[PDB]
Symmetry: D2
Subunit: 469 residues, 4 copies
């Protein structure tokens, strides 16, 4: 399926195609047209033509109408879309239905916001009139990863289109299929040509080309810190465009004395093993109070024990490079003397399946504890003081999210007030919602994403001061 430009599926100016492999049986699904720097420039040129006197005319009332249209389409095709994702990405299809649900709530939630962006009328002290507009930024290019390609698709598209920007989305080469079938829905929903363009390519070729584009007004990156620094470096070399990143971090999971146990093991099971641990906020450092530690760890072990089947909860990892980094991390974790409760071996000759991995007898500064593994691999420890879980859990330059299980409100408030995370879950984990914003503290991110906060990043403030008598 070709590049989505001006509501058409053109093909690559140089005709490059690149290969799409299925993680379940390693076979090759098909090939997808590749954008190079000439493609990116013409895409961006389409976005700007739309921005210029086309979609500036459209009314917020309608911009929401369109978004709601898109969400109903998504909803009309939950089954196709969840399949595409399971094929391309490798996720349990009952899980994939979950993911599209989140897409229909996220788009529709931003549908509501389109007509509710408002500036201010500042009563300046003198006898003058001053209004503060919020306007669209213009061309917004976003790069999304392959954890939640369709979900991340809908995060980026939503905000930008509610506010009235025109966008250019690059799908990660790993999972370029979803964003394209979504793009087909974008034509049924009644969006002008140009408003929304979807690109497939690599970070190093198109990815970059977006970042350095002198006619791109905003980039919005979701992936590894490493590439993020690249992206920041790109914006600075080009036109100083507005950047907002959501890098990943190795978040923690914390259990207390008073806390309920059966929910903990279940939520911390979900906290690391959800999406195979292939999500930004997974809970790889698990900390339990010493009193409860031994039995908890036993009770955690027992809980640990094809995507298209309905029984599966885990699945293939996205690529063998990503598989072979995960496997390099597990051997590193054992090479360091850490015991293994359960974990350490692939499943089956075909496919990238990896087992849920646990580690004990681990020190505070192994390679595995505070460097992003990005698979189903986690660490357990014993803490005793309230101030311990603080010094321990935040002993970390990556603070994207955290958790705290307790029954004592004072502990809950104090710890969560003390924790240095963009998101704190009390008695839950890995539950995101569009209403509440999501982002990285310090090195996990630059800017916040869900909620009304997203909107800030895609609007901007003009001060008009009508001075007179």
């Amino acid at each position: 399926t070709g590049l989505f430009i001006n509501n058409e599926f053109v093909k690559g100016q140089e005709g490059k195609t690149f290969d799409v492999i299925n993680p379940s049986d390693e076979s090759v699904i098909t090939q997808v047209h590749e954008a190079t720097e000439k493609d990116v420039d013409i895409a961006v040129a389409a976005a700007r033509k739309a921005f210029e006197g086309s979609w500036r005319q459209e009314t917020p009332e309608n911009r929401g109408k369109l978004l709601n249209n898109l969400a109903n389409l998504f909803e009309k095709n939950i089954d196709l879309l969840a399949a595409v994702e399971s094929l391309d990405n490798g996720k349990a299809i009952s899980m994939a239905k979950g993911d599209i649900s989140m897409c229909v709530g996220c788009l529709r939630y931003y549908g509501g916001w389109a007509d509710k962006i408002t500036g201010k009328v500042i009563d300046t002290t003198p006898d003058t009139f001053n209004y503060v507009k919020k306007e669209p930024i213009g061309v917004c290019g976003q790069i999304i990863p392959w954890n939640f390609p369709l979900l991340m698709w809908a995060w980026k598209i939503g905000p930008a289109i509610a506010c009235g920007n025109t966008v250019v989305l690059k799908t990660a080469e790993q999972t370029p299929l979803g964003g394209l079938v979504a793009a087909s829905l974008v034509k049924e929903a009644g969006f002008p040509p140009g408003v929304i363009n979807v690109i497939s390519g690599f970070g190093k070729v198109a990815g970059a080309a977006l970042s350095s584009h002198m006619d791109v007004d905003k980039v919005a990156f979701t992936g590894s810190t490493v590439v993020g620094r690249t992206i920041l470096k790109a914006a600075a070399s080009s036109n100083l465009k507005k950047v907002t990143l959501e890098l990943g971090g190795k978040s923690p999971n914390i259990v207390f004395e008073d806390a309920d146990i059966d929910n903990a093991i279940s939520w911390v099971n979900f906290g690391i093993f959800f999406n195979h641990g292939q999500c930004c906020c997974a809970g790889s450092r698990v900390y339990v109070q010493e009193s409860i530690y031994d039995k908890f760890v036993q009770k955690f072990k027992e809980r640990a024990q094809d995507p298209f089947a309905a029984d599966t909860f885990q699945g293939p990892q996205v690529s063998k490079v990503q598989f072979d980094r995960i496997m390099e991390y597990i051997q590193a974790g054992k090479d360091a003397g850490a015991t293994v409760e359960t974990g350490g071996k692939r499943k089956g000759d075909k496919g990238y399946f990896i087992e849920p991995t646990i580690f004990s007898n681990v020190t505070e500064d192994m390679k595995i504890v505070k460097e992003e593994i990005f698979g189903p691999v986690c660490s357990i420890a014993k803490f005793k003081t309230k101030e311990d879980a603080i010094k321990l859990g935040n002993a970390s330059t990556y603070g994207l999210a955290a958790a705290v299980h307790t029954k004592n409100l004072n502990t809950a408030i104090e710890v969560s007030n003390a924790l240095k995370a963009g998101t704190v879950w009390v008695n839950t984990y890995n539950t995101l919602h569009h209403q509440m914003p999501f982002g990285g503290y310090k090195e996990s991110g630059i800017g916040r994403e869900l909620g009304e906060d997203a909107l800030a990043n895609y609007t901007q403030t003009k001060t008009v001061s009508i001075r007179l008598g």
Copy 2:
């Protein structure tokens, strides 16, 4: 008067001190050209001391304090500023070289600015979201932490007040670096910081150069955010080191070249008075300045006739470079305020950033031509429109590609109204409630049942 100062130190932990290297770097008066005196120097080893102070303050001291007495500090400081307005006005006139007449204007604007933000200390509010039943979700604002702030020299004390107000309101400790050309202001201000009873390390004021101290802040691993004012190229400098270091947050306000538009029905007596105040106010040192001025094809000639100290040698030299490029371009034409006319459309003299008293006049016909001409610029920091027609005034201001638009006024700026750029003029707006967004972080707590 002029006076003789004591340790001209780095303000560190509420104390003036020197550099561990023992280095110093002269300060010179643009009027006389004599050297006023000599101010201490801060290099990487000192910035790491100051960052240590700010993080020390931030941890356990200032987290206990409340926004009402935090507020109760930014007013005291505003009071000190007013008590010694004419003193600070003098220093600032002496060092920068601007007329003591800015005693009220510039140095009071700080009092206003620091007061307003003193206001905002206890008005910071998080959120509560009604996601569902059973669950209970809220959003809270917290202080970012240590902030590096680099100011220029055009409004040394003003800028000083624009960076302390929001940062402190929100509850963050700061480490400030004055310019090399005009460090004197921040240091007296610093004595005022001690007086108003701030606890030690919530404000450290540093002196130095871009190549050394500047760099140390930008790339400092323990700095959580940085905010910067000055040339676009040093901004790009900041953004990179941010990226290499620790992805600390970056707010830039870079200067821009900014237009002034006059229509036939503009009440000419007002229009000429604003454009002149717009371009020459503070020698053209204003980031937002009427670098290029445009007049209707009907009233151009009538309009033109009615119309007719930098900080160091180097700033004095780029204007003489750009003035030379002017006559070279063939364009009809302390420092003489310079004016050019029948300047072409594509020149050096228009498109890059003079930062001195020079102005270039252009002539338009239709309304949409002034749109094409104004927003035809890489720099979009401010713009202004002088007319009387309603439909004209609001249609154009919407169209103009700038972060501040002025209608029947120029260079008149207020602290409750946000000021910023959006065409590589800047990242983020820094005045009014929106500044407080830059120096806070969001944390989301969800409780289940």
Copy 3:
């Protein structure tokens, strides 16, 4: 005009069409041919009690499970239903109220936009968190008020329906709406949509009755938590006094006012006479916001009947009482020496209204306009602002200083500049002084339909 007919006549209680306990019917007249359409059942004080009980059961039970997402979803369903039956609905509207079916369709469009908007607001109602405490945590919750009684007026029965129902349901309140005696039909047709949309039983109830019997019952009810009145100021005073004698329920009023129209010499050539035409003769002059008195600078001082037809712009008046009230008022206009230019009264224009007599004294609510003449600027502010009513006003000009200064100076809850009688859900509509209590459109409606709640948690 469309043969299909399913005009329900019952009271819409608990997602059902019941009948009056003591069974009273009351006649419905068509203002175009003075004929009786049919008869609708009447609520009385036991009906209203039953009703309030329905709403309160809903609010007490069903709406702990429901998430703001779904409250938003439902309104959108109800919008799409409204938009699927624009044609049927416009027809009832036109038949019942006697207004051109071109206008009635315009009305319903406004309904679907108003419902959608508020559907968008359900998940976006966020309370605050106050972080200025030491070793304490305080959040401020917003929550539904509870049971909200609504009394809509016959000008725009279906529009007013949406204006009331939208905000209240977004926030999580449950409501009981009394239609106007003169136009009960729309609200009941709508009520049928409310069940197809998937609202729970009880959440939304539509009563027919009178301002006296039923109207009083809602406003004096001790289990009704908030009434919302729209209509004559004489009734509003009754509504407040009801609320004070009963249980102090929170009360939002939106009464009428005599709105000014100002025209400045620099202003604009023909669309001005076009806007002021629309300004007083839109909807036959039945809008609270209509521009009764028109003011012009001295320099420049000097459609028929059947609603179901296409060419019509102006239609019947609601009834003979309204017709008769109008005739008395214009009769007084000629009686006072002012020059002059089934149910349908042709639009009159009064000059020589040099003074502020009876014709400019109070609202008329018919197609009667009054012309004034001004010449400075501070006089038009003083002539316009010279009224106990301040709900809307207009200015026409080309002039920026006059525009802003005047509209700053005018004392109306809404001020149009170079336009008139153009409302929009985004922006709040409301009255100054004796015109109103509260604000209605936009985000400010939501305040009227939520309560805050301060939780403070001590630590240590």
Copy 4:
């Protein structure tokens, strides 16, 4: 101490003046029963004067004034409250009968209160709506105009300071009436009003009785707003008069039966101290005081089952029904350590202020206000400004 008399009059147009009736009324000391002195009394014509003054102030002076200055003025007045905190602290104790320590505590709250709203004067923001068409619409906020403000006796200067804070922040002129029992406070405050530099007639302080002076404010044709604190039945009478007059905005605060709920999982030491404060604080003379308390299975001495009633629930749902089975719900409290208990029960309680592991701590930043018969409008924190502002919507059609 006790001191000179001076006029002791009506504060009108920045000067102490006297009743046109020539009526004076007596002030009694709750402690020794003595008669302190005689303050004059307002009647319908003094009110009409003061309203006239507040209108002429509003109609001219205040335009020239800029929110930056409003705020300066309010904290100036907060500065002066702090100057004579000790004086004003004692006035209040002599007049009302309240421990001098508590009066330091009350004044601090006033200075706080006034300062906060000083903060808010230049932060009043309007809206700008991006209307679908090519129009340009904004939403302005303007002052209502003349306000009537009626205070009880329990926090005569505290309440004084909540009432004038928001009102002046937003740009209104106020006309304040002081309770008959305790007018002494307000009148010094009024001396401090001139000194803080307020233009004349922006704050007028009236003394007099419920019937006469109340009625005059409530029903005054040229008052645009009233605000009321005290019994429910004078409230009803205020609402009613509003209606018969010309439809003032009415914001009222009524005092009620608040509850205190303690599960035995709560810490008993903190619980006991907090309920004791709660009900014996300010001699149970506060709207917030928690008349009834439930646990899990002239001077009047303190009383228990300034009174209180104890009873005992079992499961959690009885705790919520007992607290909310009341005509009244102005405040509440709940003492526990259970997270899920504290969040769930407080949502379920129909109160305008809930306290968890604390009672009667009240902060000017946080809005205080009443449910059901407890009040109409909330009046503290940011939300107060809403009560004293008013929305104007301008649409500008374009080409």
